[PDB]
Each structure stands twice: as C-alpha cells, then as structure tokens.
Symmetry: C3
C-alpha cells in the first residue's frame, strides 16, 4: 500500500511497507504505477516510510507473483513517460529493485545514512541493461564495475560526489525543491526529461547478455545463496 | 566586436561586448567564426572581456540569420585543427554555456558559473548541448541543470571536469603555450574522436516535437510578460 | 617474462620486465595472454614488478616485433572474454599501452605514487577508439580531453575521485579484495562484466578517425619526437 498527499503543486507518493523495508511486490508496484499515471500537480516526490527507501523485491506471500515483472515494466514505463519531474526522496537504503526505482526518479535527495547497492553478485542474479547503463551514467563506469562485480555499496556522500545524489537532505528538503520545480516551465522540463532518458540507457539486451542473464537466473547458485543464508553459513558457489 | 591578439604560437580571441555581458548576436557570432577559421598559431584562447564569459543570446541586427550563424561557429570550432582553451572568466549561461562547451579545454575563474536556465524561460535545447553537458558534469547533475536551472559553480565544475583548471586568462594562456609545443596531428585525431563520441546527435522525432512545442508555446511569452508586470510567471505548460 | 602464483582462489600475474618498466613486447604479451586464458581460480590480480605498472610498448630487440599488434589484440580479446574479474594492482605508472592494459582490467587498486597517462601528444601518436572511449568512461570526458590533447597525468588521488581507481592501496590490498570477489557468484560477475564491456567502447574507428590515425603514425613528427628524445632536446613539430 501507499500514501498519496498533495500540497500546492507537489504530489508526494510514499511507499508504505516499512515492515519489509518497502520491498516491492505485485500490489505495491500496481499502486505506484496508478499513482504516477495521475496527473494539477506539476511535480512528484517519491519516498519511503521507515528506515529504507526500498530494500528490493519480496514476492513471498505475494499470490500474483508471476505478474510482477510485467507490473514493474509498467511502473518504469509510467515513470519514464510521465511529464512530471519525479524527485526521489531517498530516505534510507535503495537496494536491488529499489536502486532501480531510485534511478528512475528524475532527481534525487538522499538521507545521510542511505546507501545504494546492487548485491547481485551475492545472490547470483543478473540485471537488465538499463539498470547497468543508468547506473554507469550516475556513478561513473568505474564505480559501476565495483558495485556490479563486487556488490560495493555507494554511500550518500559518494552518491553526492558522483551525482547519483543531487542533494543530501530529508523529505522536507525534497518537497521544498519540488515546489520550486513546480513553478518552472513544464514543456522545458518535459523536453529535457525525454532527451535525457533517450541517452541510450534504454537498451535491449544483446544475445550474449540474454544468454548470461537466463543462465544466472536459472542457476543452482541462486538457490545456494538463499540456502546459505538460511543455514547461517557462507555460500559455496559453483558457477552453475 | 572581438579582440584578437597573438603571443608566440597562441591566438587569444576576446569577446568584446561587456556592456551586454558578451551576449551573442549575429555580428559577434560571425566575427568569432571568421577569427576561428583564419587562425601560425597552434593553440587558441577564447575568453570574454569584463565580468562575463558569455551571458546568452541577445537579438535586439541581422536576427533571422542568427541560428544558421550559430550553427556555423560551432561547425568551425568542431572542425578546427586548433585546440581551443576556454578561459571562462565569468558566467556562461545559455548560448554562452553552449560556447564554453565547444571549447576543447576550460580554465575557469573562481566566481564563474555555468547554467542552462531554459526551464525558467520555457525554452528547449538542441541534443548536442544536453549530451556534451552530461558528459562534462555527469548525467546526475545534468538532470538538475536542465530540469531545475541549477547553477554549476566553479568548484563543482573542477570536480566533474567541466573545468580542467581553476585559473585566470594568464593561466589559460600559459597552458595554451605548453599545448602549442605538442604534436599537432595527435591533437587533431584525439579532438576528432572525442567530438564524435555521439554528442553530435540528430534530435529524435519526439525530441523535435517537444522542442518546437516549447519554443512556439504561450509560456515563452508569459515568462517575458512576467519580467514586465514585475511578477512571477504562471505557466500553463502550453 | 611473467610471474604467476596462486593463493586461496586468486591468481596473481606479475609483469617481470622491470629493466624496461614492464613495457610490452611480443613475448611479454603472448605470455600474459596464455596466463589469462589458462586461469580453480576465480579472481585475477594483474600487477607489475619494480617501479612501473607498465610504461608503454618497447619492441627493441623483439625478434617477433611485427607479430606484436595481432598479439596485443589477442591479449585484450582474452581479458575481455575471461569469465574472471581481473583486479589491476597498479603499482606504479601506467602509460601508453600500459594505460590501455590497466583499463582492460575489471577493477583497479592503485598505489599512492602511480599515475596514468596517454602521452600521445608528446610523441605524435594516435590511439584506437576503445582507449579513448574507456578512458572517457573512467575519468569523465572533460579530463579525457585534457589527458589526450595535453598529455595530462592522472594522479592516484584524482583517479580515485573519478573512478579510474576503485581504491588506493597496495598489491596486498588488491589480493584481499580479489579473494572476497572470488567467493561471489560467478555467473553474476560474468554477466555484469560482459554488459559493461559492451557499453559501446568497443567501437570501430570512423573513416575520418582512421585517416587521422594513419596520418599521425606515418608523420615525420613521430620521427622528430624519437630523434629529439635520443638527442635530449625539445622536439620541434611541424604538423606533418
């Protein structure tokens, strides 16, 4: 579920599953999508309740789990296509699908204890190409290689230094900047936004990327990472 | 009007409309183009007289012939075998930021700043400005500059690489002179390949549609009507 | 010649031509290639012996000098295609073909006194497009322009700032990181490695680029830079 409020010209959308650190499921993703699609508001802020912005994807207990990839695509499609600038107030950690969500925001205001991570190398998973391209664009290639190949965490401070974070601050700060942004010329925002999103980050997986992507997600190592967690021991990966 | 000096193997070109903060008009732009084309010297220094590097476009002369004049100045710098060191002595706003970015290198005064205020005036940029800006300040800051008129300070410019050094015109001339001693053909190949990174890109159909909408919009008028009624704009997104 | 040793699941490969600062020739490159291909182990650490990481290319007394290019291409093809992450332990200067090699590493751990440089503009030479593209990705376009048009050296501290260096540290630091990485999920590393390397840096030179490349390499200025070094005086270039 989600909190929706508007003040003056700023619509604030709050992920409200603080129990599961705002991990995405099918329902949360459908509700966010719907909320982005409306549109009097001239700016959106996306933030999370509790200690996390969004800690990932948690499809356990989600009964419509096979729908999820599709909903996620809808959500990102709606965010990319919205004529509104979306200011992510990243109030704590953005990990996995959460970092992916944070990167789809147009601007970012980040809390000092937040961090960004793609822990795929700890779980044997693979990302879509956009996630990798937009990350490279926001932290620089070199830090992207470390985050992707070694599960390196990007802190708020380094986020600020690279431009992943436009500002360090709180939800109040994000809302104050969104109000100012709410007073600028929409067509100007809308044109820049479209051009920027069409920088080439939106890219179909090449044949080798797809083959490796499927090998990773279909791999036994994926199971071993979860079992290792459950057995309170280190994983023994096999590369299969 | 512009000023042209040459010391050793370094041609300095000074924008000389300090009265208008070196804002571009058709005359300035065509003199610039010609100075760049006719440039004995092995390095160029491009700078502004007074407090500004270049505060934007003017138009207030041979105006309808300006856009094509500005395209050709950029064409001439892109095609120049000379490295152009931008000595960005003060603010570089709008077309002035475009011009700063077409320089090959930049030495930036401590109190200079960079800005595309299009969002305050209802305007839209060519794709090249967006792409080169993103390459120089990084995608993140580029979103902030274009979507919210954020000013890039000198310091943050040195941090991202928009500024290669912070310094004076003298600093830029001294570096132009080191660069004037280097192998011209190596400089030429690297400049060519660096400019063909993809920044020089034809607007997509959707980009051109939004560009034309923005420039033909009623909001463009409203922003000026506000600087007259001495009040804040009420944009309609149309 | 090269040195190869292994501990945990980390294969450290050492360039051992300190007498010429690990500058490349046909033999060192063939040997690095074979050690890369043959690499049980799940991480590689690439480093140099003595003061330099790799100062450039030196085909003085190289029996098989004319095979060098085809071999250099193969070395790069082999690092690019290796399922293993290579950590560059950049123990000192990486210059020319040395910087090219450092960049083909997957991650970089850099000694406080190392620096990176393409002195092409001091020797009248031209780079392949990949070198220019990956350089821009790692230090940012602005600093690339400076490094390529003015031979500017990138210090260790500024490499850390931009992401060319993921860390500042020693061989032993690089080895400890590599061993953490060697415990991560290989199909995740492999996937992300391939996508990253496929960011567009592997680019065929444009016809004008080829033409300027040949012109610089076939120039008298190239001879002049060599005659002037031998003679210990500043070169007088003519742009021909």
């Amino acid at each position: 579920m989600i909190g929706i409020t508007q003040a003056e010209a700023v619509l604030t959308i709050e992920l409200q599953r603080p129990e599961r650190r705002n991990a995405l499921n099918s329902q949360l993703v459908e509700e966010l999508t719907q909320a982005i699609r409306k549109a009097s508001a001239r700016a959106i802020v996306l933030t999370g309740q509790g200690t996390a912005f969004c800690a990932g994807a948690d499809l356990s207990g989600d009964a419509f789990a096979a729908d999820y990839p599709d909903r996620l695509i809808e959500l990102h499609k709606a965010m990319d296509a919205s004529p509104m600038p979306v200011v992510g107030a990243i109030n704590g950690p953005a990990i996995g699908a959460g970092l992916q969500l944070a990167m789809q925001c147009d601007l970012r205001v980040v809390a000092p204890d937040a961090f960004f991570q793609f822990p795929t190398s700890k779980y044997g998973l693979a990302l879509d190409n956009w996630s990798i391209r937009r990350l490279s664009s926001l932290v620089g290639h070199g830090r992207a290689r470390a985050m992707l190949l070694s599960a390196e965490k990007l802190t708020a401070e380094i986020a600020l230094h690279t431009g992943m974070a436009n500002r360090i601050g709180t939800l109040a700060d994000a809302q104050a900047w969104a109000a100012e942004i709410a007073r600028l010329a929409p067509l100007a925002i809308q044109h820049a936004k479209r051009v920027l999103n069409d920088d080439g980050a939106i890219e179909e997986a090449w044949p080798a990327h797809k083959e490796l992507f499927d090998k990773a997600w279909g791999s036994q190592d994926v199971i071993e990472a979860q079992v290792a967690r459950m057995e309170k021991r280190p994983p023994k990966f096999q590369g299969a």
